Amino acid sequence: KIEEGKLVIWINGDKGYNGLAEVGKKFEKDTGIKVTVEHPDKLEEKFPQVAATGDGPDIIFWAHDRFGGYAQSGLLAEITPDKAFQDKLYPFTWDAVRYNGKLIAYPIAVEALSLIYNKDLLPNPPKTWEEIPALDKELKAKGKSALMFNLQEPYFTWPLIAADGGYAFKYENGKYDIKDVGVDNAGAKAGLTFLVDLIKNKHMNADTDYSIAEAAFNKGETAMTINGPWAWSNIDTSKVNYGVTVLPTFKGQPSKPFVGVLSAGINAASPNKELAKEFLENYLLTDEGLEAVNKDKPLGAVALKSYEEELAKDPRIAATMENAQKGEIMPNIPQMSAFWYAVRTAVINAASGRQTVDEALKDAQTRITTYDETYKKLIMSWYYAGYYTGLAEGLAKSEQ
């Protein structure tokens, strides 16, 4: 039983959860309804687990790519904004949260990765990926490095895999073809090979995660990182003098970040759907609501036109859109979950040297094209049996 008469919200711990809680305090002040904001680890995996049993938050925030899966599983209420409200957000953001003809979440922000660089170490950022190895050689001679970014999560490596031709599912005639997958074509291989060579030549290390890359950039140890607007707040605190710019090209072609619309879905099992709609439409999705969240951790570009026109005066937000426009909106289909788990494993195995690039991407292509949602529960249960065993083994020397 989710409890009637209050709202519980889950949102990722990289986002402005404290600013969201301030909107929640204002909602309580006007309405009497208490709002509790939590940021559980792995909430995008935890949500469908607790919500399947009718528990969990009233409202879940995540990028839109997970929501078609959640909707398919019956976890998300259809939302009911009137046309006047829908006119306040850009049309392409509503398209990202439309699944089988129904709106299933409220769009909040438009997220894309950018290249973030330290202006003191590197006054003119490289326009190409190909120039990064020579730059790293130069910087290593000064005890610095050229680039560090999260290698554990395929969101960050995808822009390079997609630049020369990689794609998730082929889009044609307004539909994604779940059986036409582009993770193992010549462009995907060229980009992942380029990444793997950076690692073979010691310009990057496979054991790099978000926290490692964030610390190296914010301590002035590495000249560049790849990250979204939520990261800007810790950089601002570090006082590194940084710029936010277009991602390097690869083979003369733009990097193509997958663009996520951070969105708020309402749990199908919540008895508080009308209060959740009120909080989202009349408190959060206002200039003052989004500003409260943004002042905590930047949202980047936002779906609300009136506030996006103010935010876009900042060239960091314009650069975020410049990168977004060069990439592709994520599909929200339920097969996105298999896509990301398969690509995450492929990047990991090629980066560690466990598999060659061609072996890794061939295995990911089969895993995705032969995936069948009928077996989702079985497949996920055994993935996690493997994940907790491998995590304990990876953490071991670290205890003993």
Ligand X SMILES: OC[C@H]1O[C@H](O[C@H]2[C@H](O)[C@@H](O)[C@@H](O)O[C@@H]2CO)[C@H](O)[C@@H](O)[C@@H]1O
Give residues in contact with ligand X (CB under 6 A).
12, 14, 44, 63, 65-66, 111, 153-155, 230, 260, 262, 340
Determine, following the binding rule CB under 8 A, whether residue 205 of this chain makes contact with a copy of itself.
Answer: yes
Cβ neighbors of 7 (< 8 A, separation 6 or more) are 24, 27, 33, 34, 35, 36, 58, 59, 272, 275, 276, 279
Residue 124 in the binding site for a copy of itself (CB under 8 A):
no
Residue 382 engages a copy of itself in binding (rule: CB under 8 A): yes
Residues 243/43, Cβ–Cβ less than 8 Å: no
End-to-end, the C-alpha distance of the chain in Å comes to 42
- The whole-angstrom separation of Cα 146 and Cα 331 is 32
Residues 6+ apart with CB under 8 A from 148: 204, 208, 212, 213, 216, 217, 221, 222, 224, 225
Residue 74 region, left (φ>0) first, then alpha (ψ -120 to 50), else beta? left
Asked if 388 touches a copy of itself (CB under 8 A), the answer is yes
Residue 150 C-beta: closest distance to a copy of itself, Å: 9
CB of 3 to ligand X, least distance (A): 27
Site residue total, a copy of itself (CB under 8 A): 48
392 binds a copy of itself (CB under 8 A): yes
Say how far apart CA 188 and CA 193 lie, in whole Å.
Answer: 8
CA 131 centroid distance within chain? 27
Binding partner selected for residue 382 from ligand X, a copy of itself, none, CB under the kind-specific 5 to 8 Å limit: a copy of itself
| Residue 378 contact partner, candidates ligand X, a copy of itself, none, CB within 5 to 8 A by sort of partner | a copy of itself
* Interaction residues for a copy of itself, span 329-358 (CB under 8 A): 341-342, 344-345, 348-349, 351-352, 354
| Min CB(278)–ligand X separation in Å | 25
Sheet with 145-147, side-by-side order of all strands: 145-147, 222-227, 114-118, 242-245
Adjacent-strand bridge partners of 145: 222
Smallest separation, CB 393 to a copy of itself (Å): 6
Q: Which residue lies nearer to ligand X by CB, 16 or 248? A: 16
Helix 357-369 × helix 186-200 angle, to 10°: 140
- Which of the listed partners (ligand X, a copy of itself, none) does 93 bind, with a CB threshold of 5 to 8 Å by partner kind? none
3-state secondary structure of 7: strand
Give the interface segment with a copy of itself, choosing from 86-94, 123-131, 314-322, 392-400 (CB under 8 A). 392-400
Q: Which residue is nearest to ligand X (CB)?
A: 155
* Nearest to ligand X of 12, 365 (CB atom): 12
Q: Report the residue number, 173 or 388, with the smaller CB distance to a copy of itself.
A: 388
Binding site for a copy of itself (CB under 8 A): 151-152, 205-209, 211-212, 341-342, 344-345, 348-349, 351-352, 354, 363, 366-367, 370-371, 375, 377-400
